[PDB]
Write a protein that binds this ligand. Structure first.
Ligand SMILES: NC(=O)C1=CN([C@@H]2O[C@H](COP(=O)(O)OP(=O)(O)OC[C@H]3O[C@@H](n4cnc5c(N)ncnc54)[C@H](OP(=O)(O)O)[C@@H]3O)[C@@H](O)[C@H]2O)C=CC1
Ligand SMILES: NC(=O)C1=CN([C@@H]2O[C@H](COP(=O)(O)OP(=O)(O)OC[C@H]3O[C@@H](n4cnc5c(N)ncnc54)[C@H](OP(=O)(O)O)[C@@H]3O)[C@@H](O)[C@H]2O)C=CC1
Ligand SMILES: NC(=O)C1=CN([C@@H]2O[C@H](COP(=O)(O)OP(=O)(O)OC[C@H]3O[C@@H](n4cnc5c(N)ncnc54)[C@H](OP(=O)(O)O)[C@@H]3O)[C@@H](O)[C@H]2O)C=CC1
Ligand SMILES: NC(=O)C1=CN([C@@H]2O[C@H](COP(=O)(O)OP(=O)(O)OC[C@H]3O[C@@H](n4cnc5c(N)ncnc54)[C@H](OP(=O)(O)O)[C@@H]3O)[C@@H](O)[C@H]2O)C=CC1
Ligand SMILES: NC(=O)C1=CN([C@@H]2O[C@H](COP(=O)(O)OP(=O)(O)OC[C@H]3O[C@@H](n4cnc5c(N)ncnc54)[C@H](OP(=O)(O)O)[C@@H]3O)[C@@H](O)[C@H]2O)C=CC1
Ligand SMILES: NC(=O)C1=CN([C@@H]2O[C@H](COP(=O)(O)OP(=O)(O)OC[C@H]3O[C@@H](n4cnc5c(N)ncnc54)[C@H](OP(=O)(O)O)[C@@H]3O)[C@@H](O)[C@H]2O)C=CC1
Ligand SMILES: NC(=O)C1=CN([C@@H]2O[C@H](COP(=O)(O)OP(=O)(O)OC[C@H]3O[C@@H](n4cnc5c(N)ncnc54)[C@H](OP(=O)(O)O)[C@@H]3O)[C@@H](O)[C@H]2O)C=CC1
Ligand SMILES: NC(=O)C1=CN([C@@H]2O[C@H](COP(=O)(O)OP(=O)(O)OC[C@H]3O[C@@H](n4cnc5c(N)ncnc54)[C@H](OP(=O)(O)O)[C@@H]3O)[C@@H](O)[C@H]2O)C=CC1
Lengths: 330, 331, 331, 330
């Protein structure tokens, strides 16, 4: 397993991050535990979760499933960089005021609930699930600093920010000696490359890690066409993946992709993961296995070496915009 | 004429900015001078130029045309908010001698002196970075700009062709030491190119910069370029961005739908494109690029136009925009 | 016993610092406790340890031995300035699990709780970075240290095996936000190894840090290791730094001339090495490394020694220093 | 000609810096002018001089030689990044108090005398010739900021600093908005590598350029043994080169070096220049041609590509210490 610094900070992380969103809705508790043990054995030390994971009436069950994995002992908590999230609504449409978003009030109650469900006295990387345009950064950093100085959190990260939100957050932190965002968790894969325009350039300038969520675009990139005939699609049958397959242009993009990999004898989920590991500034993908065999597939992807010929072919099927301002001006 | 504050600062500007890029290579000195006179009489107090305008062997020619305009007296200099730019290469077109382009303190020093001499004035009101320079750090840039501010050679600093995050970083760096940051960003924004909506304009609004849109007609493409296609002359639409766009069928189809839609409503295409930008949140105004006195008078009419809800939603249907990031590509 | 301030801060320490690295692997618990009783009896109030001391499968034993010493009551904890360290890997062999070594806020959090538990105390007086960690930035480091300061778990932060510029960067970073910076640097400094004079000690003096010299006998090399090679008696001087040095003919001759020189002046070689450090400008004191009670008594006599200008000049001839940079390699 | 950024700042410089110390005492004015013409023709845009160059009674002659070179028009001043120094006594022996070192008083008088000899209104890179332990950085930066605001200088650089002087200087400048040191000029070559302990690592941390002076160790690395018997006005017959040849251990090193290059068919002056160009953090060497052909030789050196065998062999003869604390502790 390959390791790297999370951006500028002293934390060392595997280049595969174990995403846990499937643990609960799609993967049951015992198989989730087995995937986590296997991730440790493979050397993955960085787990991503969220308070909202679990779905519906079971929002929080993913954190509880990690809670019960830690509670088995065997140094599991001490070996894992534990990341979770605040912002989302923990109830079932419109949230009660200040029971979502990034007000200091919601941060206080959400961290306590997450810490209770995880059965740990601290979160290593506490992440904003989304930018909240209504909460100023001096409020946010007050809230996080209270938790840092109490020992309840160590690091702060962002998710689904714009590039200028990262700049504003970390400049505001720096004014008063505070450690800023250490990482941005953004959507980035072969199908969706617009994080290249500003999010990733800004993350690189401010020395944040970049960890890519839905690195297979919700399963689209892991052989979802091939699997339509055999009914192997689960997550790839809803959400981003199903919407993309319904669109003729996007579907044919995936078709050329699966065909090209057939010619080269490569697995499509592994190529997509390995492709992110080549992108400048990307710490690594947050893999989303539903089975232990999908985790092992991800582990093999971390060792894949893509040829320049495949890389340029993938670029031709899935072009990116590159950085702003050049992406749309000159 | 409608006026507004330039973002957060005390400067008041007309919602039309006179672009001068045509003055020299496309419009001769005499028509250039009459456009500016008509612009002043219309109430336009905000002029944008650059050291490189004039093109080719005549880079600098535009600044000189503005200089001989000012030298006529008549309160012209005192009345005009004068903006020029630094970054471009001023030598032989081709690879620049090191530090004769970009935003080193060295090039800023030599460029502003040469602009002042050609403009024949002792100060520039709005000195703009023509493009982001990823290799010059902001404490170097702001040192160079502040030297000029304290000498009285410039008043305000602005940006052009920045990423939203460059705006944040520039103004956070300026604010740490009590300097006035960027006051405006000059970005490509029109009906055909809306991606400044993702992060440039949101960042500019958060930091209280003016937003002034260059090539607001996409270089002539939205000026009735199809209807006038087989016409001739020195039309800006007959080459560059507008021509290349008309040879792509998808882009060409958009313009066709647009000109047809405006026939149905009795509206001029050039005028609608300007009026449409004036409705966009955070936009100070377009930088209009008249070739002729009559195109300027037409720009002035566009600032009095009131587009209906019906035309706006139809314009959206032809030219959809992405919205802000991250919602534009994530959720 | 002579006392001095630790660099610029209000803390007063004896100029002999008790090192404990031998306590466990080389000196058993009973003799380690006797050595500590006798150090307190001689007025030594400043003890240096580390989480890794104990070796191999017994990393942590040295801290546990101090813990059981403090547990014997008698004002011991209250009387001693207790220093320990974080950075080292606590596991047996091979590369550490990620973030179970080095200076991330994550390892700092877990290392100080394990140290506090082994030491059986609610605070460490001087919490030291065992080594520079080039991968952790200072705003992360000072965040984790400031958490412990405000909780009352540490009082003071120090460095060890830093470069001079790390010292400067650390304390400049702390001072920008009203944090007390590093209060001391623990660096290798003795007759045999003098290159800390190039830049580490100068930076430490500029920033007002104490300087406490580890392996002040160069791992026993300077305590009569050649004589004891035939009489028997080398333990620590049989391995590591000292064994390597004697494997080199030029370094072995330095030691020979050293022991010859002191035979003639009637002086003990370990005592001269300690006393020489006490003369070096900026040096708070040596961290003595006694293996036995009698080696501690020897160290205490060395703190009363006075080395003549003749001896000092002879030692400088045998063991030349580089002096400060840039003069050491340039002019 | 290869160009690079001078450390972190926006200034672009040729990786060969033209040193001028020979111009006056060693190379006459006509050939000095000729060397400068050749340097500019080869694309070198970065010249180093000092107020004291000229030596003895003729301190200032080098700046005067550059002054008359600029006066021959040709876009010369506009094209050259012009660098000189302050610290040295301009009156030889014990200096009148405040007529050497870095007091605000000596800085004021030295820069005016330098600007007059150079016949220019501004110095692009004004460098401290040496650390001055008796002047504090708030006084130095006050003096330099007066010059920046009057437009008499653009950039400040250091020379013969310790690494910790660099950190203290730039931390002090950054505290109050000032651009700190942009470059450090240090003794660094195959024979003298102790800048690797702390000077160069500190420069790299603070984003300083690194330009090495006497990159052939005063001619010692330019073929000095092959040429030891020949007469003439050779730098290698005097100064530090001659002292090293009288030490047996340093002569043997040069012998092995010259012999090694005989077998590979390489020129010793060019190899040493090319070697510095491989060192991480190093902007470039400050070449010290005595003749126009020695300049052409330096230009070829910047195009040489040393092989790993040669690099390993050079490391065997000329071992470096590496960074502190590892170089002496662990
Ligand atoms: N910050 C945010 O806003 C978001 C965060 N995340 C985080 O990132 C993690 C990954 O997100 P996710 O969408 O699940 O990731 P993916 O894009 O990789 O989709 C996961 C699905 O892809 C399929 N798949 C997984 N691994 C492989 C493999 N080797 N080979 C082939 N197919 C494979 C499975 O599909 P199938 O079920 O059909 O078998 C899996 O359920 C999440 O667990 C979460 O922690 C994700 C969403 C939003
Ligand atoms: N209230 C909640 O907690 C959640 C609500 N949803 C709903 O699902 C819809 C789209 O997601 P889905 O169809 O299930 O699968 P998708 O393939 O479209 O999206 C996959 C992941 O993207 C993230 N996401 C996408 N859209 C939203 C949104 N409005 N709000 C919050 N997170 C979003 C979620 O991950 P992530 O949880 O990391 O944000 C989701 O698991 C949304 O309209 C949303 O209302 C989806 C997930 C959580
Ligand atoms: N910061 C930067 O990088 C850039 C800055 N700019 C600045 O922005 C200014 C505008 O740029 P430019 O490309 O010229 O802007 P436009 O795209 O609006 O104008 C180009 C052409 O549009 C047509 N036109 C202009 N006004 C009208 C009008 N009322 N009605 C109908 N057609 C009209 C003319 O085309 P035709 O000749 O075919 O009739 C004109 O020559 C420039 O002068 C410059 O100051 C411009 C480019 C880059
Ligand atoms: N053969 C030619 O190209 C000739 C051009 N001109 C004048 O040049 C202008 C049109 O420029 P053109 O490039 O031909 O067509 P484009 O439509 O491609 O360029 C429009 C403007 O965008 C900006 N720009 C676009 N690309 C670049 C780039 N690599 N680098 C720097 N700036 C860029 C320039 O404005 P900005 O300078 O503000 O950056 C340019 O004037 C017109 O004003 C025309 O009068 C005159 C005679 C001949
Ligand atoms: N920060 C860091 O990296 C380091 C920290 N340290 C700290 O510094 C302390 C000293 O280190 P250490 O290497 O032990 O110091 P020394 O250089 O003094 O070596 C100790 C050995 O020297 C001999 N000796 C000790 N005292 C005398 C004396 N009066 N007279 C004659 N010989 C004597 C004994 O040798 P013998 O066994 O042969 O009898 C002893 O085991 C350590 O305990 C530790 O606290 C030390 C190493 C690294
Ligand atoms: N702590 C150790 O002794 C470790 C040693 N090693 C390996 O053993 C060699 C030195 O062992 P030893 O004979 O005891 O050293 P020496 O006898 O030569 O030096 C004595 C002390 O120096 C310190 N030290 C020296 N090298 C290292 C190193 N890589 N890492 C951490 N501390 C070091 C240790 O003190 P202190 O613990 O205070 O730093 C050691 O007690 C090294 O080459 C290394 O490869 C590897 C990891 C840890
Ligand atoms: N900041 C400081 O303290 C210092 C600054 N400097 C600056 O650095 C510059 C270089 O210093 P300097 O000592 O002259 O550098 P060198 O050590 O490279 O040059 C001295 C001699 O090297 C020989 N030589 C030069 N070029 C070549 C070449 N291609 N091929 C073979 N031999 C060659 C010549 O020796 P020979 O005559 O025998 O043929 C030359 O006179 C100086 O001009 C000055 O700008 C220099 C010293 C101190
Ligand atoms: N002493 C002599 O016999 C004569 C010397 N010269 C010139 O002086 C240079 C010969 O070097 P030399 O000084 O004799 O001995 P070195 O060769 O050891 O010195 C070479 C350079 O290092 C720098 N330097 C070295 N030591 C000192 C020091 N105490 N103080 C200040 N700077 C120092 C000087 O450059 P920097 O000034 O940049 O610091 C010097 O030019 C040549 O450039 C020569 O042209 C000319 C006529 C007679």
């Amino acid at each position: 397993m390959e390791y790297t610094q999370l951006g500028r900070i002293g934390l060392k992380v595997s280049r595969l991050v174990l995403g846990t969103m499937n643990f609960g809705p799609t993967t049951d508790e015992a198989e989730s535990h087995a995937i986590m043990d296997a991730a440790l054995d493979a050397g993955i030390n960085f787990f991503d979760t969220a308070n909202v994971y679990g779905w519906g009436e079971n929002k929080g069950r993913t954190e509880e499933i990690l809670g019960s994995w830690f509670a088995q002992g065997g140094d599991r908590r001490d070996k894992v960089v534990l990341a979770t999230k605040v912002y989302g609504n923990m109830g079932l449409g419109p949230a009660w005021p200040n029971h979502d978003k990034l007000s200091a009030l919601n941060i206080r109650r959400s961290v306590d609930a997450s810490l209770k469900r995880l059965g740990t006295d601290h979160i290593d990387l506490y992440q904003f699930h989304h930018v909240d345009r209504d909460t100023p950064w001096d409020e946010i950093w007050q809230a996080m600093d209270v938790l840092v100085r109490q020992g309840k959190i160590l690091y702060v990260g962002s998710s689904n920010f714009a590039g200028w939100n990262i700049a504003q957050a970390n400049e505001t932190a720096a004014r008063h000696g505070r450690l800023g965002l250490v990482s941005e968790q953004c959507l980035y894969n072969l199908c969706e490359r617009r994080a290249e325009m500003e999010v990733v350039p800004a993350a690189r300038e401010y020395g944040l890690g970049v960890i890519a969520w839905s690195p297979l675009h919700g399963g689209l990139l892991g052989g979802a066409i091939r699997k339509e005939q055999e009914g192997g699609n689960r997550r790839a049958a809803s959400g981003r993946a199903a919407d993309a397959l319904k669109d003729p242009q996007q579907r044919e993009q995936i078709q050329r992709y699966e065909d090209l990999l057939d010619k080269h004898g490569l697995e499509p989920g592994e190529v997509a993961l390995a492709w992110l590991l080549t992108r400048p500034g990307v710490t690594g993908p947050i893999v989303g296995p539903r089975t232990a065999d999908q985790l092992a597939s991800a582990v093999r992807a971390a060792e894949l070496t893509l040829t320049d010929e495949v890389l340029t072919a993938l670029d031709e099927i899935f072009p990116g915009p590159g950085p702003s301002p050049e992406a749309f001006a000159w």
